[PDB]
């Protein structure tokens, strides 16, 4: 059997976290926090890996004390255990500080079940969409980083090596990853299941294993605002786009078509199209 660990993050529901122009702020109060939607695909893949190969899946979150409800929503997928890294020693952490906590969080999981055969993260969180925790976690363990996974082909549990289909910008590519690996799952991998009641009822009366900074044995100031190299100095909402102008009208039946290409070339961004160079460069 394999050992899967799914690092999930409790993220505010950013479909509802919207911009209020009159206060010039994010009105995110009252909006409940959910799983990161890139991580619901990671949890559904882990539940698929549990019913196909019997892999003991853990789920770990370094977050606030209100993030134990995200860890209970991960047990609704059918997972074995949830692990909470809850301490305000970990508050205000950046990616290097999160990964240092998550490396020592998964290292204590390794003292329970064995060496972790697969680490599933999401492609991005939505609050602070950096996406560097997954890449960062493959470097602490020295594992194979398969990022931006769109498909899973052969997950050979005997050869301890699986074939993913990583998305890049020039195109997808099949990659023979060598387990132990750290995957990083996109939205396009699968669609997460509607959870059954015996797992959802078990998810309600479940208490995730809470580990403080004394429980892990890490450095006390390598995890919070002190183990954070970067510092967020100011957060500010963007502007109100930019008022446009009806280039053409309802009269011009087509003469509006070249008036579009007339006014395209006044913009800087048409250099970036990679297919409008024969009308810009010439």
């Amino acid at each position: 059997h394999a050992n899967v660990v799914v690092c999930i993050k409790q993220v505010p529901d950013t479909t509802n976290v919207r911009i209020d122009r009159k206060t010039n702020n994010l009105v995110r109060e009252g909006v409940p926090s959910i799983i990161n939607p890139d991580d619901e695909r990671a949890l559904e893949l882990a539940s698929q890996l549990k019913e196909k190969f019997g892999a003991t899946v853990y789920v770990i979150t370094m977050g606030p004390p209100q993030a134990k409800e995200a860890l209970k929503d991960a047990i609704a997928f059918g997972l074995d255990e949830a692990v909470h890294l809850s301490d305000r020693t970990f508050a205000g952490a950046d990616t290097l500080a999160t990964t240092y906590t998550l490396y020592w969080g998964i290292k204590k999981i390794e003292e329970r079940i064995g060496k972790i055969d697969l680490i599933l993260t999401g492609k991005q969180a939505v609050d602070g969409d950096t996406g560097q925790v997954g890449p960062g976690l493959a470097t602490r363990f020295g594992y194979a980083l398969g990022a931006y996974v769109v498909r899973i082909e052969e997950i050979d549990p005997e050869k301890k090596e699986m074939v993913i289909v990583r998305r890049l910008d020039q195109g997808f590519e099949k990659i023979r990853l060598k387990l132990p690996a750290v995957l990083t799952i996109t939205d396009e991998l699968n669609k997460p299941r509607y959870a059954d009641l015996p797992n959802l009822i078990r998810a309600i009366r479940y208490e995730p294993i809470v580990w403080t900074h004394k429980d892990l044995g890490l450095d006390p100031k390598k995890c919070g605002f002190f183990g954070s190299p970067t510092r967020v100095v100011s957060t500010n909402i963007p502007p109100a786009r930019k008022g446009g102008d009806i280039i053409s009208k309802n009269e011009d039946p087509e003469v509006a078509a070249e008036k579009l290409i007339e006014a395209l070339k006044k913009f800087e961004a048409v250099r970036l199209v990679e297919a409008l160079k024969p009308v810009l460069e010439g």
Partner: protein
């Protein structure tokens, strides 16, 4: 002293030709080195047989070029790049590392920054130098483009910053300037191959709708699915994906994987075509992170015109096939 403030820019090359973001960051670091005291813009480049672009970087504004040489660096393996891009950071000790926010760039920078134990901001749009401690103010969009958070790394070195492709501006290639090209013939030895690339599937085999440079989308002004072939004629012309609205997906015209908006996919192209979309707030919350929004619909009192950059009031079956007709005769006059 002066050569310890040595700002790096990684060059993303795809076989033989570099990514365009490699020269938008070289030009941006010139504006960073103009406000940084006693600094120079390097360029880190990995592979063999890329002198046709290592000289191109110096024409774009690279002061020097660190041209790391190995045969196994022409393909992209982040396991191999990280082993070389932390030896070339421990040796030369840079101040500002800059990679573009391509999918290889964001994946590589996360592996690199936690070997150096430094600070890294991803998909930045607002790089600037503060005059107090000469620090880089890396402004990046968070919350899907709803908070431009400004993040500063005070003391850890290098201040790595993954930068979004397209927000910076290019310098023109000038053959007047030259610079030293440092070749470090990199050795790996026994390397214990983890990542093994089998194939390379083209990007148009699936629906991208976030990594497409052009998204032409429509709904309810695209009468039937017959008009969405007219939108796909403009999609594959511009090398981009065709999107949709909820009023097109719910009518069964395209698959729900083509839906753009709040409960669909948030696009970030450089050119969005709101072809027949009214522009409700649930739809335009997925397109507001784009660069150009073109709106073609028959109602002049539409809420898409309050977000559009180019606005056309007119029919869709008489403008969009009449735009891809004109775009074919201009794309072929400079093809041959």
């Amino acid at each position: 002293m002066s050569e310890k403030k040595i700002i790096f820019v990684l060059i993303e090359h795809h076989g033989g030709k570099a990514h365009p973001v490699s020269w938008e960051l070289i030009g941006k670091a010139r504006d960073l080195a103009s406000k940084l005291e006693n600094s120079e813009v390097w360029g880190v480049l990995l592979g063999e047989g890329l002198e046709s672009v290592a000289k191109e970087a110096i024409q774009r504004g690279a002061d020097k070029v660190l041209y790391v040489k190995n045969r196994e660096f022409n393909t992209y393996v982040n396991y191999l790049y990280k082993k070389a891009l932390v030896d070339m950071v421990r040796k030369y000790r840079p101040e500002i590392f800059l990679i573009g926010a391509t999918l290889e760039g964001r994946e590589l920078a996360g592996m690199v920054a936690t070997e150096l134990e430094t600070g890294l901001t991803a998909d930045c749009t607002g790089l600037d130098i503060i005059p107090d401690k000469k620090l880089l103010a890396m402004t990046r969009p968070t919350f899907g483009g709803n908070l431009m958070a400004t993040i500063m790394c005070p003391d850890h070195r290098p201040q790595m910053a993954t930068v979004r492709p397209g927000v910076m501006k290019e310098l023109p290639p000038d053959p007047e300037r030259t610079g030293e090209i440092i070749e470090e013939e990199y050795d790996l030895g026994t390397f214990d191959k983890l990542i093994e690339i089998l194939e390379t599937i083209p990007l148009q085999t699936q629906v991208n709708l976030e990594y497409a440079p052009v998204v032409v989308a429509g709904g309810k002004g695209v009468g039937g699915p017959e008009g969405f072939k007219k939108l796909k004629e403009l999609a594959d012309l511009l090398g981009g994906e065709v999107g949709a609205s909820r009023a097109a997906v719910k009518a069964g015209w395209i698959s729900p994987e083509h839906q753009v908006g709040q409960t669909g996919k948030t696009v970030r192209p450089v050119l969005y075509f709101a072809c027949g979309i009214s522009g409700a707030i649930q739809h335009v919350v997925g397109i507001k992170e784009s660069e150009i929004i073109v709106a073609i619909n028959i109602d002049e009192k539409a809420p898409i015109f309050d977000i559009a950059d180019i606005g056309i009031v007119g029919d869709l079956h008489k403008v969009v096939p009449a735009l891809t007709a004109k775009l074919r005769e201009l794309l072929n006059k400079s093809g041959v």
